[PDB]
A paper describes a structure:
Compounds 2 and 3 are bidentate ligands that combine the two terminal residues of the GM1 oligosaccharide, i.e. galactose and sialic acid. The cholera toxins come in two varieties: classical (c) and El Tor (ET). The two biotypes differ at two amino acid residues in the B-subunit, 18 and 47 (His18 and Thr47 in cCTB, and Tyr18 and Ile47 in ET CTB). The crystal structures were solved to 1.1 Å resolution and contain one B-pentamer in the asymmetric unit. Both CT variants have well-defined electron density for inhibitor 2 in all binding sites. As in the other structures, the galactose moiety of 2 is buried in the GM1 binding site, H-bonding with Glu51, Gln61, Asn90 and Lys91. The sialic acid residue has direct interactions with the backbones of Glu11 and His13. The differences to GM1-os binding can be seen in the linker region of 2, where the hydrogen bond of the core Gal to the side chain of His13 is no longer achievable. Instead, closer to the terminal Gal, the carbonyl group of the linker engages in a water-mediated interaction to Asn14.
Numbering used by the authors:
A (entry chain C), B (entry chain B), C (entry chain A), D (entry chain E), E (entry chain D): 1 to 103
The structure:
């Protein structure tokens, strides 16, 4: 089991770490069908999604996907600093796999 | 995949964007049978609903409908500025499809 | 579909609007069997319940009853002003159907 | 149906009301198997549990047990004054049946 | 049934108590498949995980694991002082079994 987000991110293909060290600039969420997703942006312009659940996801991920959207909403509303994101870079917007908050 | 609320909204028939840039003026929710819904208003007089779940919705939307009502309640209570709403205009009140929030 | 709590309230028998324009004075909830309920009061003496889920409720109400208890708890803790309650007046305490909040 | 916690509490065998009129001093929760429970204390040394779900509990209590732990956690974190607890006194620590919050 | 975290912790093999008396320094969560987990750190560098649900868990733990991640996220965001953790020390990072919070 990994020790931190960077090492966790390295356990997967098609990923990279971004170091934001910043609060979320905007939070978007949709209930429209086939676009049940969240999008966040940061002041540096970067855009990220929580993907719509799909055939690529295994069942254990479904609750985690819901949790992540909960996290991002409350992080946005609390202006919590996001340290790093681990994202899949084979999707546009890049798709969030993990988040770290600190400081 | 769309990268913002405007482009997401334009992927559907009978939708449009409203630009509020304001906090929610009032939040209403009901548990009454056949009216399990939320209504929000803004100071400019705009009125929007989160629709009662029905057969027009696909199954993936159900969780997202519940999440949206969670989002609107907390946005109301935290006085978060709503940037945009994507709504369906073939319902009265217009029905919320997506929300964006920014400073 | 109604556009406000008063109009929604009028779509049911044995209801009435109470206008509070006040924060909740006390919040009570129970896990005891057959009394899985919430009770709120206001400083004017008014007492209201969220009913125990029962035979009178249709399936779609179950989630909304849980949400209403969530809403009342957080309204209480944040001292949010309650504008109106739509209540059924054929129960004692009167039973909450809907809530509106505004500053 | 009862209109307050004292009257509700009195509808059960082996219960009693504790009047605290104080915030929660500590909140403990466990995910350890067979100890999936919460324990709260007050500065006067009083200790109470939310019981591990068991065959004592009827089906309708299961959701309310989980809500109660949610309520205690957020009460703790908001420093909300707990007015009274209804507890079962045939368990050690005494087991929470209901809570009221008021100033 | 135990009356505090220390006593609860001692009801299990492969456990120990850490005394932090500090807020969480960082919160990390992941939705990546097979790594649906959370990791927290404290300012002294100590790292702890909420484990991915696995064969070792009994069914009653599944809700509690989800609750714990909820608790850690809100504790982090509120800067709530963690008193103690009970952890399994046969995993790395050490795996949280229970948490106590006190000011
Ligand atoms: C910690 C761990 O188990 N890591 C392993 C992961 C993992 O098992 C799967 O991602 C879980 O579904 O599977 C890895 C991985 O890198 O994703 N894997 C999986 C595969 C074949 C199938 C595959 O790529 N599945 C993941 C698809 C990705 O899903 C992601 C969501 O979870 C994203 O949507 C991403 O854009 C998509 O490409 N080849 N390698 C190998 C890696 O060692
Ligand atoms: C991104 C994407 O998939 N967009 C497509 C959507 C989408 O597949 C469905 O809305 C999902 O159920 O379906 C579109 C759409 O515009 O809604 N669509 C669907 C249909 C036939 C069935 C249909 O109209 N379904 C939507 C009904 C609408 O549901 C909405 C709630 O989700 C609202 O209640 C709205 O008032 C109602 O008219 N014709 N066009 C075509 C669009 O390209
Ligand atoms: C918008 C809408 O659909 N409104 C209709 C409602 C509604 O369909 C039901 O209340 C939903 O279960 O059903 C109405 C009503 O006023 O409740 N209705 C229902 C009936 C027969 C069955 C009936 O009385 N159901 C409601 C029972 C009430 O349930 C309530 C909880 O939802 C309360 O517990 C209340 O104390 C109880 O009397 N006769 N009229 C007629 C109303 O036009
Ligand atoms: C409002 C109401 O319905 N009150 C009634 C309750 C109630 O139906 C049950 O407690 C719900 O499970 O059942 C009462 C009660 O006092 O608990 N009851 C139940 C019984 C036989 C079964 C029984 O004792 N159930 C309660 C066991 C208690 O469960 C509790 C959790 O719910 C606690 O764990 C407690 O420590 C334990 O003794 N005898 N009396 C009679 C009481 O009139
Ligand atoms: C209060 C109580 O019932 N405590 C008992 C626990 C308990 O029943 C189980 O841990 C619940 O699954 O089972 C104890 C224990 O110490 O965990 N137990 C269990 C066993 C054999 C199987 C076993 O070790 N299960 C626990 C595995 C542990 O799961 C943990 C998560 O729950 C961690 O992942 C840990 O890293 C792992 O070793 N031997 N002793 C004996 C202890 O008296």
């Amino acid at each position: 089991t990994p020790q931190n987000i960077t090492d966790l991110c390295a356990e997967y293909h098609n990923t990279q770490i971004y170091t934001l060290n910043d609060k979320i600039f905007s939070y978007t969420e949709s209930l429209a069908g086939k676009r049940e997703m969240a999008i966040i942006t940061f002041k540096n312009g970067a855009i990220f999604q929580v993907e719509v659940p799909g055939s690529q996801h295994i069942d254990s991920q479904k609750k985690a996907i819901e949790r992540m959207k909960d996290t991002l909403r409350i992080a946005y509303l609390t202006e919590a600093k996001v340290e790093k994101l681990c994202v899949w870079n084979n999707k546009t917007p890049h798709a969030i796999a993990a988040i770290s908050m600190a400081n």
